[PDB]
CSV table of all heavy atoms in Angstrom, one decimal:
chain,number,residue,atom,x,y,z
T,6,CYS,N,-0.6,5.3,-14.6
T,6,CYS,CA,-0.5,6.7,-14.4
T,6,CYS,C,-1.7,7.3,-13.5
T,6,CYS,O,-1.5,8.2,-12.7
T,6,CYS,CB,-0.4,7.5,-15.7
T,6,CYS,SG,1.0,7.0,-16.7
T,7,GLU,N,-2.8,6.7,-13.7
T,7,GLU,CA,-4.0,7.1,-13.0
T,7,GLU,C,-3.7,7.0,-11.5
T,7,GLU,O,-4.1,7.8,-10.7
T,7,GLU,CB,-5.2,6.2,-13.4
T,7,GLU,CG,-6.4,6.4,-12.5
T,7,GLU,CD,-7.6,5.5,-12.9
T,7,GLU,OE1,-7.3,4.3,-13.2
T,7,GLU,OE2,-8.7,5.9,-12.9
T,8,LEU,N,-3.1,5.9,-11.1
T,8,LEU,CA,-2.8,5.7,-9.7
T,8,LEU,C,-1.7,6.6,-9.3
T,8,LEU,O,-1.8,7.3,-8.2
T,8,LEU,CB,-2.3,4.2,-9.4
T,8,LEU,CG,-2.0,3.9,-8.0
T,8,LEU,CD1,-3.2,4.1,-7.1
T,8,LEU,CD2,-1.5,2.4,-7.9
T,9,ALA,N,-0.7,6.8,-10.1
T,9,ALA,CA,0.4,7.7,-9.8
T,9,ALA,C,-0.2,9.1,-9.5
T,9,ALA,O,0.2,9.7,-8.5
T,9,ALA,CB,1.4,7.8,-11.0
T,10,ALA,N,-1.1,9.5,-10.3
T,10,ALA,CA,-1.7,10.8,-10.1
T,10,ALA,C,-2.5,10.8,-8.8
T,10,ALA,O,-2.4,11.8,-8.0
T,10,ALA,CB,-2.7,11.1,-11.2
T,11,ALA,N,-3.3,9.8,-8.5
T,11,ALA,CA,-4.0,9.7,-7.3
T,11,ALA,C,-3.1,9.7,-6.0
T,11,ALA,O,-3.4,10.4,-5.0
T,11,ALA,CB,-4.9,8.4,-7.3
T,12,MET,N,-2.0,9.0,-6.1
T,12,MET,CA,-1.1,9.0,-5.0
T,12,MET,C,-0.4,10.3,-4.8
T,12,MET,O,-0.2,10.8,-3.7
T,12,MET,CB,0.0,7.9,-5.2
T,12,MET,CG,-0.6,6.5,-5.3
T,12,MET,SD,0.7,5.2,-5.3
T,12,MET,CE,0.0,4.0,-4.2
T,13,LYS,N,0.0,11.0,-5.9
T,13,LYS,CA,0.6,12.3,-5.8
T,13,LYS,C,-0.3,13.3,-5.2
T,13,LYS,O,0.1,14.1,-4.4
T,13,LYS,CB,1.1,12.7,-7.2
T,13,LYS,CG,1.8,14.1,-7.2
T,13,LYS,CD,2.4,14.3,-8.6
T,13,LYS,CE,3.1,15.6,-8.6
T,13,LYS,NZ,2.1,16.7,-8.5
T,14,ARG,N,-1.6,13.1,-5.5
T,14,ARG,CA,-2.6,14.0,-5.0
T,14,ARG,C,-2.8,13.8,-3.5
T,14,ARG,O,-3.2,14.8,-2.8
T,14,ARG,CB,-3.9,13.7,-5.7
T,14,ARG,CG,-5.1,14.6,-5.4
T,14,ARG,CD,-6.3,14.3,-6.4
T,14,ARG,NE,-5.9,14.4,-7.8
T,14,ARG,CZ,-5.8,13.4,-8.6
T,14,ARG,NH1,-6.0,12.2,-8.2
T,14,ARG,NH2,-5.4,13.6,-9.9
T,15,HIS,N,-2.5,12.6,-3.0
T,15,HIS,CA,-2.7,12.3,-1.6
T,15,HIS,C,-1.4,12.5,-0.8
T,15,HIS,O,-1.2,12.1,0.3
T,15,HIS,CB,-3.2,11.0,-1.3
T,15,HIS,CG,-4.7,10.9,-1.6
T,15,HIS,ND1,-5.2,10.8,-2.9
T,15,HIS,CD2,-5.8,10.9,-0.8
T,15,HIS,CE1,-6.5,10.7,-2.8
T,15,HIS,NE2,-6.9,10.8,-1.6
T,16,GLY,N,-0.4,13.2,-1.5
T,16,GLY,CA,0.9,13.5,-0.8
T,16,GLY,C,1.9,12.4,-0.6
T,16,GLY,O,2.7,12.5,0.4
T,17,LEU,N,1.9,11.3,-1.4
T,17,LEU,CA,2.9,10.3,-1.3
T,17,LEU,C,4.2,10.5,-1.9
T,17,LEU,O,5.2,9.8,-1.6
T,17,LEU,CB,2.3,8.9,-1.8
T,17,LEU,CG,1.4,8.2,-0.8
T,17,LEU,CD1,1.0,6.9,-1.4
T,17,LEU,CD2,2.0,8.0,0.5
T,18,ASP,N,4.3,11.4,-2.9
T,18,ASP,CA,5.5,11.6,-3.6
T,18,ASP,C,6.6,12.2,-2.7
T,18,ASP,O,6.5,13.3,-2.3
T,18,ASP,CB,5.3,12.6,-4.8
T,18,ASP,CG,6.6,12.8,-5.6
T,18,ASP,OD1,7.4,11.9,-5.7
T,18,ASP,OD2,6.7,13.9,-6.2
T,19,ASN,N,7.6,11.4,-2.5
T,19,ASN,CA,8.8,11.8,-1.6
T,19,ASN,C,8.4,11.8,-0.1
T,19,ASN,O,9.2,12.3,0.7
T,19,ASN,CB,9.3,13.2,-2.0
T,19,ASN,CG,9.9,13.2,-3.4
T,19,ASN,OD1,9.8,14.2,-4.1
T,19,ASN,ND2,10.4,12.1,-3.8
T,20,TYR,N,7.3,11.2,0.2
T,20,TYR,CA,6.8,11.2,1.6
T,20,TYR,C,7.9,10.3,2.4
T,20,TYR,O,8.2,9.2,2.0
T,20,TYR,CB,5.5,10.5,1.7
T,20,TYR,CG,4.9,10.6,3.1
T,20,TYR,CD1,4.3,11.7,3.6
T,20,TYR,CD2,5.0,9.5,4.0
T,20,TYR,CE1,3.8,11.8,4.9
T,20,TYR,CE2,4.5,9.6,5.3
T,20,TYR,CZ,3.9,10.7,5.7
T,20,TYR,OH,3.4,10.8,7.0
T,21,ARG,N,8.5,10.9,3.4
T,21,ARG,CA,9.5,10.2,4.2
T,21,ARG,C,10.7,9.9,3.3
T,21,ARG,O,11.4,8.9,3.6
T,21,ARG,CB,8.9,8.9,4.8
T,21,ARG,CG,7.8,9.2,5.8
T,21,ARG,CD,8.3,9.7,7.2
T,21,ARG,NE,9.0,8.6,7.9
T,21,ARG,CZ,9.3,8.8,9.2
T,21,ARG,NH1,9.1,9.9,9.9
T,21,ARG,NH2,9.9,7.7,9.8
T,22,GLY,N,10.9,10.6,2.2
T,22,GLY,CA,12.0,10.4,1.4
T,22,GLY,C,11.8,9.3,0.3
T,22,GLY,O,12.7,9.0,-0.4
T,23,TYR,N,10.6,8.8,0.1
T,23,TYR,CA,10.3,7.8,-0.8
T,23,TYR,C,9.6,8.4,-2.1
T,23,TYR,O,8.4,8.7,-2.0
T,23,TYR,CB,9.4,6.7,-0.2
T,23,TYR,CG,10.2,5.8,0.8
T,23,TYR,CD1,10.0,6.0,2.2
T,23,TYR,CD2,11.0,4.8,0.4
T,23,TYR,CE1,10.7,5.3,3.1
T,23,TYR,CE2,11.7,4.0,1.3
T,23,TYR,CZ,11.5,4.2,2.6
T,23,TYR,OH,12.2,3.4,3.5
Side-chain angles (χ1 to χ4, degrees):
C6 300
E7 171 181 41
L8 181 60
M12 299 187 136
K13 181 167 179 296
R14 186 173 303 107
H15 285 77
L17 279 185
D18 183 34
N19 296 150
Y20 188 80
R21 297 283 286 189
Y23 289 100

